[PDB]
Design a protein around this ligand. Structure first.
Ligand code: HUF
Lengths: 666, 8, 133
């Protein structure tokens, strides 16, 4: 889409309709005349288009009105109400951008942000953008959180997220214009190579993918059309629904074969019964013909009974002879209906070992996409957010996805090597106790009005607790925390010094010996200018390969590589880096998923902020003091970098509304 | 979650 | 609203694979053994039906007699009449076979012959006796 309707779409917003969250800020317009609404939508929409057209500089109210046209630029209070609404919820003036109206001399309010992960920096810049006092506490010695880029010499490779899942409606699209980062399109063609070292033929390769895609749809049928979502009081996982689908089809192969072979025995019994009638016809013919020859011996002139018995036997024998030919002609038809059936038997097996070994690889990829074994994804919900997909090609960063978080950190107050370890939120404010990672003796106390918590769900999940909440989080929260899934996925970075792969191929897969290792080093990427190959460990392989030394993982990687490229063409790598996100204390995992028994409505529970109890009994219910952002708090966009950033934007909006007041809801 | 490296 | 073409997913199948974890392996095993039983069963009738095909070699070519190419005449020779009366006793109302035995009388003037000579040759007594068998 283009025009002002494109600005709405590029902002994840219906152009022709007013959102739940615009209704709450503009209830007068929602219940008003359908014409004022349309006014509003165009009054809105337009504004986003100006922001998008030049996102490197602040979009001030004055400029917006100046470029709005009659009759829209009349009700200035509406344009004020709109431009304030957007700026506040970070649909405009978010990211880098030169500031037309430099920041206020005196700040109001004090928020501590836990973690300078991408969500963290997003809120921070926004809150600071809003005249607030922001301080970010990072346990690491670098920013970016799960956005981690490895740079040595000219080698560059992300250990963290490395793809921009399409610019259609992507806020990263705005950031790209702002922070120049080299985005490279990813050629989707991917050829698989079995363990033997030989490429799978296209006919099998196309044949297998379609079955996998068909199989997925099948599960959806089970879920939505047959209410297959509980089983012995437990919730059905996608993995369970895949086996039961494959099983039902295997069964159906056997069902077809039994029908085909039963058709055979039906004919053979007819044929065998038909033969019996032909023997017992022939022997009747044998016997008569004797009688005829015997009766014929009486020589003429014979009296007429003897003459009858000659002619009489002749009719009988011929009569039985025309029978036996009809029978040997029904024979003829059934003896070919039997080579027809042998000529057209059904399929031997639904799937052979080679097939299931390639179909493993397609499941490995699905486990990579969800960072978890398919036996954990909820059947009903694992793809709840599979509707807000961005459009366009997926892309990589050629210069390290680490540049984005580093760009965001510019001019913010970040305490590095600062491990928050206890959060105390009270009616009158909060204090955060953090220690020093380098030296754990050194203790720090941080007092503030609100605390924004971008702690990964893995860190949030840990027993015993990496971080103490006093008072404890309420059960409605903690139980949402156990229900959700935090998955794992790891990468191996192979740093060579010759280029020996098909350079025109970004990605190519390795097929596993077994279902159990379907994720083990199953896929490689040539994304980087330098000679760098990068290899994935997903599914059940993921958590296991963390118990194995680099040199073993690297050795296995080279072996798969040698078998596919020739044992001579594969040098030793000059640098090697293996990731351990599950092991990592500041992540305890990779990103999240919708575990069996969860739903996208846990992701909403995660975002609801906590309002603490009254200090003195009978005191009025206070302000909410603790809030939550990061990848696991945004329902329509979990487990991405853009999703985490949007949650940051979200809370900065929510924070500011609570402590700076909303002056746009009149 | 859902499925990556594709434009659907 | 219907599963992808080729997928076979009916309600009844699906309970039966999930009653317990083992059930899915079981049902498949029954179909394997059940399929094998038909294959064993075939190769008997395939063998037995091979036995009978051998007992029927040569066909019946040696036991055949040539064709009686005989223009149908009208008048009734006294043998043609006497052949007839025995034919009725041994055949009943099967006019074709009775018209074969005689050979030059077609099936209508068989029927006509029963009419005109019914009193003269005491027919019905013959038929009564023919039924008695
Ligand atoms: C291996 C891999 C690959 C991909 C992706 C992810 C991964 C892992 N992800 C997900 C994002 O990485 C993640 O959701 C986001 O970074 C959240 O980002 P987020 O929501 O900000 O989580 P964070 O870890 O960045 O922020 C948490 C911060 O909190 C800090 N911290 C923790 N405990 C602390 C404490 N006690 N005190 C102080 N600080 C503490 C921690 O060090 C970190 O800085 C992708 N996303 C995307 O868009 N494209 C992609 O290709 C990918 N990718 C591959 O496909």
């Amino acid at each position: 889409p283009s025009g002002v309707e494109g600005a709405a779409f590029q902002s994840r917003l219906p152009h022709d309709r007013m959102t739940s969250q615009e209704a709450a800020c503009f209830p007068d317009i929602i219940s008003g005349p359908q014409q004022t609404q349309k006014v509003f939508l165009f009054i809105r929409n337009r504004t986003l288009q100006l922001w998008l057209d030049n996102p490197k500089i602040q979009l001030t109210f004055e400029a917006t009105l100046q470029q709005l046209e009659a009759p829209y630029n009349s009700d200035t209070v509406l344009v004020h109400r709109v431009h304030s609404y957007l700026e506040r919820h970070g649909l405009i003036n978010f990211g880098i951008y030169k500031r037309i109206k430099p920041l206020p001399t005196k700040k109001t309010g004090k928020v501590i942000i836990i973690g300078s992960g991408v969500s963290g920096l997003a809120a921070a810049r926004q809150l600071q953008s809003f005249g607030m006092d922001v301080t970010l506490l990072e346990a690491r010695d670098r920013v970016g959180g799960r956005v981690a880029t490895f740079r040595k010499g000219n080698y560059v490779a992300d250990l963290g997220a490395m793809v921009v899942t399409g610019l259609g409606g992507n806020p990263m699209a705005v950031v790209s214009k702002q922070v120049n980062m080299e985005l490279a399109k990813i050629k989707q063609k991917c050829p698989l190579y079995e363990a033997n070292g030989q490429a799978v033929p296209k006919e099998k390769d196309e044949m297998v993918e379609q079955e996998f895609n068909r199989l997925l749809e099948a599960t959806s049928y089970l879920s939505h059309q047959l209410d297959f979502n509980v089983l012995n009081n437990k919730p059905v996982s996608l993995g369970q629904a895949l086996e039961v689908v494959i099983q039902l089809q295997e069964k159906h192969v056997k069902d077809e074969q039994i029908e085909h072979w039963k058709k055979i025995v039906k004919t053979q019994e007819e044929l065998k019964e038909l033969l019996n009638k032909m023997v017992n016809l022939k022997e009747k013919i044998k016997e008569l013909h004797q009688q005829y020859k015997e009766a014929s011996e009486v020589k003429p002139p014979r009296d007429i009974t003897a003459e009858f018995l000659v002619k009489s036997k002749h009719r009988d024998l011929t009569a039985l002879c025309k029978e036996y030919d009809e029978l040997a002609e029904t024979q003829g038809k059934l003896e070919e209906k039997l080579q027809e059936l042998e000529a057209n038997p059904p399929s031997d097996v639904y799937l052979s070992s080679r097939d299931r070994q390639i179909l493993d690889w397609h499941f490995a990829n699905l486990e990579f996409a969800n960072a978890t074994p398919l036996s954990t994804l909820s059947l009903k919900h694992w793809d709840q957010d599979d509707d807000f997909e961005f459009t366009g090609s997926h892309l990589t960063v050629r210069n390290g996805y680490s540049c984005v978080p580093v760009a965001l950190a510019e001019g913010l107050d970040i305490k590095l090597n600062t491990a928050v370890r206890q959060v105390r939120y009270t009616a009158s404010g909060c204090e955060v106790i953090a220690v020093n990672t380098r030296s754990t003796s050194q203790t720090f106390i941080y007092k503030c009005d609100a605390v924004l918590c971008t702690l990964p769900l893995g860190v949030l999940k840990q027993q015993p607790p990496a971080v103490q909440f006093v008072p404890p989080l309420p059960e409605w929260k903690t139980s949402a925390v156990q229900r959700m899934g935090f998955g794992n996925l790891n990468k191996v970075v192979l740093c060579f010094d010759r280029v020996f792969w098909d350079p025109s191929v970004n990605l190519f897969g390795h097929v596993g010996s077994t279902t159990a290792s379907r994720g083990e080093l199953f896929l490689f990427w040539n994304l980087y200018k330098a000679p760098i190959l990068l290899a994935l460990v997903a599914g059940e392989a993921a958590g296991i390969m963390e118990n194995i030394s680099d040199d073993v993982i690297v050795g296995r990687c080279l072996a798969i590589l040698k078998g596919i490229f020739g044992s001579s063409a594969v040098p030793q790598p000059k640098e090697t880096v293996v990731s351990r996100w599950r092991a990592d204390p500041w992540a305890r995992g990779s990103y999240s998923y919708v575990a069996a028994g969860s739903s996208g409505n846990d992701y909403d529970l995660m975002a609801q902020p906590i309002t603490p109890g009254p200090s003195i009994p009978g005191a009025p219910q206070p302000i909410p003091r603790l809030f939550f952002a990061g990848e696991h708090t945004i329902r329509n966009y979990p487990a991405t970098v853009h999703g985490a950033l949007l949650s940051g934007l979200r809370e900065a909006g929510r924070i500011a509304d609570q402590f700076l007041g909303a002056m746009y809801t009149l | 979650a859902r499925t990556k490296q594709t434009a659907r | 609203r219907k599963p992808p073409k080729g997928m076979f997913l009916s309600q009844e199948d699906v309970e039966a694979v999930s009653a317990n974890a083992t059930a899915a392996t079981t049902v498949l095993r029954q179909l394997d053994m059940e399929l094998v039983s038909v294959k064993r069963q075939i190769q008997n009738i395939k063998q037995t039906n091979s036995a009978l095909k051998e007992k029927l070699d040569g066909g019946i070519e040696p036991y055949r007699l040539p064709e009686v190419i005989q223009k149908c005449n009208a008048r009734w020779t006294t043998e043609e009449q006497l052949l007839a009366v025995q034919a009725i006793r041994k055949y009943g109302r099967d006019f074709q076979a009775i018209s074969d035995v005689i050979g030059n009388k077609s099936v209508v003037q068989v029927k006509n012959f029963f009419v005109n000579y019914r009193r003269r040759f005491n027919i019905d007594e013959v038929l009564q006796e023919w039924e008695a068998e």
